[PDB]
């Protein structure tokens, strides 16, 4: 059997050099000089592979409530921007539920929502609301940087902080 | 879920017929079996093994002058009854993955020694025949597809060969 962390590292390197459309199982198998069946032992399909790559790329991504939101979002966006198509990949892993880390990130953001006076039945909805903005914002930005900044990002994020203040 | 080998071969043959050899991919095969791609590798280590199985699937009924003529008549007609039939059989002969195509060369070998071919040139004479058959049929099927005597010429070239075999 292949050693997982090897595979996810080769996968991440394909993403950085060639982008997310080129991250396929056949291409991963060839760079690893391995039988494609050995890869499917670890990952059922591309969505499960993408989930581990996302956990890998967010491994460095995760005080005062208003401050704890601005900071966890800044660190999320900076990690998405350090890899080719990072925000798109992480957006798809969130949707598919295949990344533990993004849910760990969101669960954190909920807490900051409780604090701001957000009711307990609407906490994770508020968390997600923030994460949809960040993904939404950074997919757009990254697409445009790649077909050749944070001021706007902060400003958008300042709207959500206020809206959470009104509970 | 439970995938059996003959079902995959049948599905693969269906894709070949409806869409041609370029569309016969491991992910599309898995999609038409309604299956994750990993299930295919229970039975096939790679695409070239898969193509060899469908080469033998479509050549299943296809297996001294007259014996050459008949063996070749039966081969070309099996080939012509599947989209890209000859290109697929050409690729599985090169890769050694086709079991029944080997048998046909053996059978042509016997006839070749019957015409007086030296023992060391038997296999080359047999393959010389297959090369002409493949070359012709590959050309023919591609011309048949460019549509917005055939058998006459086939047997003519095949006779040039039977004549040359007589020395």
CSV table of C-alpha atoms in Angstrom, one decimal:
chain,number,residue,atom,x,y,z
A,1,UNK,CA,0.0,0.0,0.0
A,2,UNK,CA,0.9,3.5,-0.7
A,3,UNK,CA,1.8,5.8,2.1
A,4,UNK,CA,-1.0,8.4,2.2
A,5,UNK,CA,1.0,11.5,3.0
A,6,UNK,CA,3.2,10.7,0.0
A,7,UNK,CA,0.1,10.7,-2.2
A,8,UNK,CA,-1.4,13.8,-0.9
A,9,UNK,CA,1.9,15.6,-1.2
A,10,UNK,CA,2.3,14.5,-4.9
A,11,UNK,CA,-1.3,15.6,-5.4
A,12,UNK,CA,-0.7,19.0,-3.9
A,13,UNK,CA,2.4,19.5,-6.1
A,14,UNK,CA,0.2,18.7,-9.2
A,15,UNK,CA,-2.3,21.3,-8.0
A,16,UNK,CA,0.4,24.0,-7.5
A,17,UNK,CA,2.1,23.4,-10.9
A,18,UNK,CA,-1.0,22.7,-13.0
A,19,UNK,CA,-4.2,23.7,-11.3
A,20,UNK,CA,-7.2,21.9,-10.1
A,21,UNK,CA,-8.6,20.7,-13.4
A,22,UNK,CA,-5.3,18.8,-14.1
A,23,UNK,CA,-5.5,17.1,-10.6
A,24,UNK,CA,-7.0,13.8,-11.8
A,25,UNK,CA,-6.4,10.2,-10.6
A,26,UNK,CA,-4.8,9.1,-13.8
A,27,UNK,CA,-2.3,12.0,-13.6
A,28,UNK,CA,-1.6,11.5,-10.0
A,29,UNK,CA,-1.0,7.8,-10.7
A,30,UNK,CA,1.5,8.6,-13.4
A,31,UNK,CA,3.6,11.2,-11.3
A,32,UNK,CA,3.7,8.6,-8.5
A,33,UNK,CA,4.8,6.0,-11.1
A,34,UNK,CA,2.2,3.7,-9.6
A,35,UNK,CA,-0.7,1.5,-10.6
A,36,UNK,CA,-4.0,3.5,-10.6
A,37,UNK,CA,-5.6,0.8,-8.5
A,38,UNK,CA,-3.2,1.6,-5.7
A,39,UNK,CA,-4.5,5.1,-5.6
A,40,UNK,CA,-8.2,4.1,-5.4
A,41,UNK,CA,-7.2,2.1,-2.3
A,42,UNK,CA,-6.9,5.4,-0.4
A,43,UNK,CA,-9.4,7.6,-2.3
A,44,UNK,CA,-12.7,6.4,-3.7
A,45,UNK,CA,-12.9,9.3,-6.2
A,46,UNK,CA,-11.5,12.8,-6.9
A,47,UNK,CA,-13.8,14.4,-4.3
A,48,UNK,CA,-12.2,12.3,-1.5
A,49,UNK,CA,-8.7,13.0,-2.9
A,50,UNK,CA,-9.6,16.7,-2.9
A,51,UNK,CA,-10.6,16.5,0.7
A,52,UNK,CA,-7.2,15.3,1.9
A,53,UNK,CA,-5.4,17.9,-0.2
A,54,UNK,CA,-7.6,20.6,1.5
A,55,UNK,CA,-6.7,19.3,5.0
A,56,UNK,CA,-3.1,19.4,3.9
A,57,UNK,CA,-3.3,22.9,2.7
A,58,UNK,CA,-5.2,24.2,5.7
A,59,UNK,CA,-2.9,22.6,8.3
A,60,UNK,CA,-1.5,26.0,9.3
A,61,UNK,CA,-4.8,27.8,8.8
A,62,UNK,CA,-6.4,27.2,12.2
A,63,UNK,CA,-9.2,36.5,22.1
A,64,UNK,CA,-11.8,39.2,21.6
A,65,UNK,CA,-14.7,38.0,19.5
A,66,UNK,CA,-14.6,40.6,16.8
A,67,UNK,CA,-10.9,40.1,16.6
A,68,UNK,CA,-11.1,36.3,16.5
A,69,UNK,CA,-13.2,36.5,13.3
A,70,UNK,CA,-11.0,38.9,11.5
A,71,UNK,CA,-8.0,36.8,12.2
A,72,UNK,CA,-9.3,33.3,11.6
A,73,UNK,CA,-10.6,34.6,8.2
A,74,UNK,CA,-7.3,36.4,7.4
A,75,UNK,CA,-5.4,33.1,8.0
A,76,UNK,CA,-7.9,31.1,6.0
A,77,UNK,CA,-7.7,33.4,3.0
A,78,UNK,CA,-3.9,33.6,3.2
A,79,UNK,CA,-3.7,29.8,3.1
A,80,UNK,CA,-6.1,29.6,0.1
A,81,UNK,CA,-3.9,32.1,-1.7
A,82,UNK,CA,-0.7,30.1,-1.2
A,83,UNK,CA,-1.8,27.4,-3.7
A,84,UNK,CA,-3.0,27.4,-7.3
A,85,UNK,CA,-6.8,27.3,-7.2
A,86,UNK,CA,-6.7,26.9,-3.4
A,87,UNK,CA,-10.0,28.6,-2.7
A,88,UNK,CA,-11.9,26.7,-5.4
A,89,UNK,CA,-10.6,23.3,-4.1
A,90,UNK,CA,-11.4,24.2,-0.5
A,91,UNK,CA,-14.9,25.4,-1.6
A,92,UNK,CA,-15.6,22.0,-3.1
A,93,UNK,CA,-14.3,20.1,-0.1
A,94,UNK,CA,-16.6,22.1,2.2
A,95,UNK,CA,-19.6,21.3,0.0
A,96,UNK,CA,-18.7,17.6,-0.1
A,97,UNK,CA,-18.0,17.4,3.6
A,98,UNK,CA,-14.6,15.8,2.9
A,99,UNK,CA,-12.4,18.3,4.8
A,100,UNK,CA,-12.2,18.0,8.6
A,101,UNK,CA,-10.3,21.1,8.9
A,102,UNK,CA,-12.8,23.5,7.4
A,103,UNK,CA,-15.5,22.2,9.6
A,104,UNK,CA,-13.1,22.6,12.6
A,105,UNK,CA,-12.6,26.2,11.4
A,106,UNK,CA,-16.3,26.8,11.2
A,107,UNK,CA,-17.0,25.3,14.5
A,108,UNK,CA,-14.6,27.9,15.8
A,109,UNK,CA,-16.3,30.6,14.1
A,110,UNK,CA,-19.6,29.6,15.6
A,111,UNK,CA,-18.2,30.3,19.1
A,112,UNK,CA,-17.3,33.8,18.1
A,113,UNK,CA,-20.9,34.0,17.0
A,114,UNK,CA,-22.3,32.9,20.4
A,115,UNK,CA,-20.2,35.5,22.0
A,116,UNK,CA,-21.5,38.3,19.9
A,117,UNK,CA,-25.0,37.5,21.1
A,118,UNK,CA,-26.1,35.2,18.3
A,119,UNK,CA,-28.7,32.7,19.4
A,120,UNK,CA,-27.7,29.1,19.8
A,121,UNK,CA,-30.0,27.8,17.0
A,122,UNK,CA,-28.5,30.2,14.5
A,123,UNK,CA,-24.8,29.9,15.4
A,124,UNK,CA,-23.5,27.6,12.8
A,125,UNK,CA,-25.6,29.4,10.2
A,126,UNK,CA,-23.7,32.5,11.1
A,127,UNK,CA,-20.4,30.7,10.9
A,128,UNK,CA,-21.2,29.4,7.5
A,129,UNK,CA,-22.4,32.8,6.4
A,130,UNK,CA,-18.9,34.2,7.1
A,131,UNK,CA,-17.1,31.2,5.4
A,132,UNK,CA,-19.3,31.6,2.2
A,133,UNK,CA,-18.1,35.2,2.0
A,134,UNK,CA,-14.5,34.3,2.4
A,135,UNK,CA,-14.7,31.5,-0.2
A,136,UNK,CA,-16.8,33.6,-2.4
A,137,UNK,CA,-14.3,36.5,-2.1
A,138,UNK,CA,-11.2,34.4,-2.6
A,139,UNK,CA,-12.4,32.3,-5.5
A,140,UNK,CA,-13.0,35.6,-7.3
A,141,UNK,CA,-9.7,37.1,-6.4
A,142,UNK,CA,-7.7,34.0,-7.2
A,143,UNK,CA,-9.3,33.6,-10.6
A,144,UNK,CA,-8.4,37.1,-11.4
A,145,UNK,CA,-4.8,37.0,-10.1
A,146,UNK,CA,-4.2,33.8,-12.2
A,147,UNK,CA,-5.7,35.4,-15.3
A,148,UNK,CA,-3.0,38.1,-14.8
A,149,UNK,CA,-6.6,43.4,-2.2
A,150,UNK,CA,-7.1,42.9,1.5
A,151,UNK,CA,-8.6,46.3,2.0
A,152,UNK,CA,-11.8,45.1,0.4
A,153,UNK,CA,-11.5,41.8,2.2
A,154,UNK,CA,-11.4,43.5,5.5
A,155,UNK,CA,-14.2,45.9,4.6
A,156,UNK,CA,-16.5,43.0,3.6
A,157,UNK,CA,-15.6,41.3,6.8
A,158,UNK,CA,-16.4,44.4,8.7
A,159,UNK,CA,-20.0,44.2,7.5
A,160,UNK,CA,-20.4,40.8,8.9
A,161,UNK,CA,-18.9,41.7,12.3
A,162,UNK,CA,-21.4,44.5,12.6
A,163,UNK,CA,-24.4,42.3,11.6
A,164,UNK,CA,-23.4,39.8,14.2
A,165,UNK,CA,-23.2,42.7,16.8
A,166,UNK,CA,-26.9,43.3,16.4
A,167,UNK,CA,-27.2,39.6,17.3
B,1,UNK,CA,-22.1,-3.7,-4.3
B,2,UNK,CA,-20.6,-6.5,-6.4
B,3,UNK,CA,-19.0,-6.2,-9.8
B,4,UNK,CA,-18.4,-9.2,-12.0
B,5,UNK,CA,-15.8,-9.3,-14.7
B,6,UNK,CA,-18.0,-10.2,-17.7
B,7,UNK,CA,-20.4,-7.3,-16.9
B,8,UNK,CA,-17.5,-4.9,-17.1
B,9,UNK,CA,-16.3,-6.3,-20.4
B,10,UNK,CA,-19.8,-6.0,-21.8
B,11,UNK,CA,-20.2,-2.4,-20.6
B,12,UNK,CA,-16.8,-1.6,-22.2
B,13,UNK,CA,-17.9,-3.1,-25.4
B,14,UNK,CA,-21.0,-1.0,-25.4
B,15,UNK,CA,-19.0,2.1,-24.9
B,16,UNK,CA,-16.8,1.2,-27.8
B,17,UNK,CA,-19.7,0.6,-30.1
B,18,UNK,CA,-21.5,3.8,-29.2
B,19,UNK,CA,-18.7,6.2,-28.8
B,20,UNK,CA,-15.5,4.7,-30.2
B,21,UNK,CA,-12.2,3.8,-28.7
B,22,UNK,CA,-11.1,7.3,-27.6
B,23,UNK,CA,-14.1,7.5,-25.3
B,24,UNK,CA,-13.4,4.1,-23.7
B,25,UNK,CA,-11.9,5.4,-20.5
B,26,UNK,CA,-11.8,3.9,-17.0
B,27,UNK,CA,-13.9,6.8,-15.5
B,28,UNK,CA,-16.5,6.6,-18.2
B,29,UNK,CA,-16.6,2.8,-17.9
B,30,UNK,CA,-17.2,3.1,-14.2
B,31,UNK,CA,-19.9,5.7,-14.9
B,32,UNK,CA,-21.8,3.4,-17.1
B,33,UNK,CA,-21.6,0.6,-14.6
B,34,UNK,CA,-22.7,3.0,-11.9
B,35,UNK,CA,-19.7,2.3,-9.8
B,36,UNK,CA,-16.6,4.1,-8.3
B,37,UNK,CA,-13.6,3.6,-10.6
B,38,UNK,CA,-11.8,1.5,-7.9
B,39,UNK,CA,-14.2,-1.4,-8.5
B,40,UNK,CA,-12.8,-1.8,-12.0
B,41,UNK,CA,-9.3,-2.6,-10.6
B,42,UNK,CA,-10.6,-5.7,-8.8
B,43,UNK,CA,-10.6,-7.2,-12.3
B,44,UNK,CA,-8.2,-5.2,-14.4
B,45,UNK,CA,-4.8,-3.7,-13.4
B,46,UNK,CA,-4.9,-1.1,-16.2
B,47,UNK,CA,-6.5,0.1,-19.4
B,48,UNK,CA,-4.3,-2.1,-21.6
B,49,UNK,CA,-5.5,-5.2,-19.8
B,50,UNK,CA,-9.1,-4.0,-20.2
B,51,UNK,CA,-8.7,-3.5,-23.9
B,52,UNK,CA,-7.3,-6.9,-24.3
B,53,UNK,CA,-10.3,-8.4,-22.6
B,54,UNK,CA,-12.7,-6.6,-25.1
B,55,UNK,CA,-10.4,-7.6,-28.0
B,56,UNK,CA,-10.9,-11.2,-27.0
B,57,UNK,CA,-14.6,-10.5,-26.4
B,58,UNK,CA,-15.2,-9.2,-30.0
B,59,UNK,CA,-12.9,-11.8,-31.5
B,60,UNK,CA,-14.6,-14.8,-29.8
B,61,UNK,CA,-16.3,-16.1,-32.8
B,62,UNK,CA,-13.6,-15.2,-35.2
B,63,UNK,CA,-11.5,-18.3,-34.3
B,64,UNK,CA,-3.5,-24.1,-47.0
B,65,UNK,CA,-4.4,-21.2,-49.3
B,66,UNK,CA,-8.0,-21.5,-48.4
B,67,UNK,CA,-7.3,-21.5,-44.6
B,68,UNK,CA,-5.4,-18.3,-44.9
B,69,UNK,CA,-8.3,-16.8,-46.8
B,70,UNK,CA,-10.9,-18.0,-44.4
B,71,UNK,CA,-9.1,-17.0,-41.2
B,72,UNK,CA,-8.6,-13.5,-42.6
B,73,UNK,CA,-12.2,-13.3,-43.8
B,74,UNK,CA,-13.4,-14.1,-40.4
B,75,UNK,CA,-11.1,-11.7,-38.7
B,76,UNK,CA,-11.9,-8.7,-40.8
B,77,UNK,CA,-15.6,-9.3,-40.4
B,78,UNK,CA,-15.4,-9.6,-36.6
B,79,UNK,CA,-13.4,-6.3,-36.7
B,80,UNK,CA,-15.9,-4.5,-38.9
B,81,UNK,CA,-18.8,-5.4,-36.6
B,82,UNK,CA,-17.6,-3.0,-33.9
B,83,UNK,CA,-16.8,0.7,-34.0
B,84,UNK,CA,-13.0,1.1,-34.0
B,85,UNK,CA,-12.8,-2.7,-33.9
B,86,UNK,CA,-9.5,-2.9,-35.8
B,87,UNK,CA,-7.7,-0.1,-34.0
B,88,UNK,CA,-8.6,-1.8,-30.7
B,89,UNK,CA,-7.4,-5.2,-31.8
B,90,UNK,CA,-4.2,-3.5,-33.2
B,91,UNK,CA,-3.4,-2.0,-29.8
B,92,UNK,CA,-4.0,-5.3,-27.9
B,93,UNK,CA,-1.8,-7.2,-30.3
B,94,UNK,CA,1.1,-4.7,-29.8
B,95,UNK,CA,0.6,-4.9,-26.0
B,96,UNK,CA,0.4,-8.7,-26.0
B,97,UNK,CA,-2.9,-8.5,-24.0
B,98,UNK,CA,-5.1,-10.3,-26.5
B,99,UNK,CA,-5.3,-14.0,-26.0
B,100,UNK,CA,-7.3,-14.9,-29.1
B,101,UNK,CA,-5.3,-12.8,-31.5
B,102,UNK,CA,-2.3,-14.9,-30.5
B,103,UNK,CA,-4.2,-18.0,-31.5
B,104,UNK,CA,-4.9,-16.6,-34.9
B,105,UNK,CA,-1.3,-16.0,-35.6
B,106,UNK,CA,-0.5,-19.6,-34.5
B,107,UNK,CA,-3.1,-20.9,-36.9
B,108,UNK,CA,-1.7,-18.8,-39.7
B,109,UNK,CA,1.8,-20.1,-38.8
B,110,UNK,CA,0.7,-23.7,-39.5
B,111,UNK,CA,-0.5,-22.7,-42.9
B,112,UNK,CA,2.7,-20.8,-43.6
B,113,UNK,CA,4.9,-23.8,-43.0
B,114,UNK,CA,2.6,-25.8,-45.2
B,115,UNK,CA,3.5,-23.5,-48.1
B,116,UNK,CA,7.2,-24.1,-47.4
B,117,UNK,CA,8.2,-21.4,-45.1
B,118,UNK,CA,11.4,-21.9,-43.2
B,119,UNK,CA,10.9,-22.6,-39.5
B,120,UNK,CA,12.5,-19.3,-38.5
B,121,UNK,CA,10.3,-17.3,-40.9
B,122,UNK,CA,7.0,-18.9,-39.9
B,123,UNK,CA,6.1,-16.3,-37.3
B,124,UNK,CA,7.1,-13.4,-39.4
B,125,UNK,CA,5.0,-14.6,-42.2
B,126,UNK,CA,2.0,-15.1,-40.0
B,127,UNK,CA,2.4,-11.6,-38.5
B,128,UNK,CA,3.0,-10.2,-42.0
B,129,UNK,CA,-0.6,-11.3,-42.8
B,130,UNK,CA,-2.1,-9.8,-39.7
B,131,UNK,CA,-0.3,-6.6,-40.3
B,132,UNK,CA,-1.9,-6.3,-43.7
B,133,UNK,CA,-5.3,-7.2,-42.4
B,134,UNK,CA,-5.1,-4.7,-39.5
B,135,UNK,CA,-3.7,-2.0,-41.8
B,136,UNK,CA,-6.5,-2.4,-44.3
B,137,UNK,CA,-9.3,-2.7,-41.8
B,138,UNK,CA,-8.1,0.3,-39.8
B,139,UNK,CA,-8.0,2.3,-43.0
B,140,UNK,CA,-11.4,1.0,-44.1
B,141,UNK,CA,-13.3,1.7,-40.8
B,142,UNK,CA,-11.8,5.2,-40.7
B,143,UNK,CA,-13.0,5.9,-44.3
B,144,UNK,CA,-16.4,4.4,-43.4
B,145,UNK,CA,-16.7,7.0,-40.7
B,146,UNK,CA,-15.8,9.9,-43.0
B,147,UNK,CA,-19.3,10.1,-44.5
B,148,UNK,CA,-20.3,13.7,-43.6
B,149,UNK,CA,-14.9,-3.6,-54.1
B,150,UNK,CA,-14.3,-3.2,-50.4
B,151,UNK,CA,-14.1,-6.9,-50.1
B,152,UNK,CA,-12.8,-7.2,-53.6
B,153,UNK,CA,-9.6,-5.5,-52.8
B,154,UNK,CA,-9.3,-7.1,-49.4
B,155,UNK,CA,-9.1,-10.5,-51.0
B,156,UNK,CA,-6.9,-9.1,-53.8
B,157,UNK,CA,-4.2,-8.0,-51.3
B,158,UNK,CA,-4.6,-11.2,-49.4
B,159,UNK,CA,-3.9,-13.2,-52.6
B,160,UNK,CA,-0.7,-11.2,-53.3
B,161,UNK,CA,0.3,-12.6,-50.0
B,162,UNK,CA,-0.7,-16.3,-50.6
B,163,UNK,CA,1.2,-16.1,-53.9
B,164,UNK,CA,4.3,-14.8,-52.3
B,165,UNK,CA,4.0,-17.5,-49.7
B,166,UNK,CA,4.4,-20.1,-52.5
B,167,UNK,CA,8.2,-20.5,-53.3
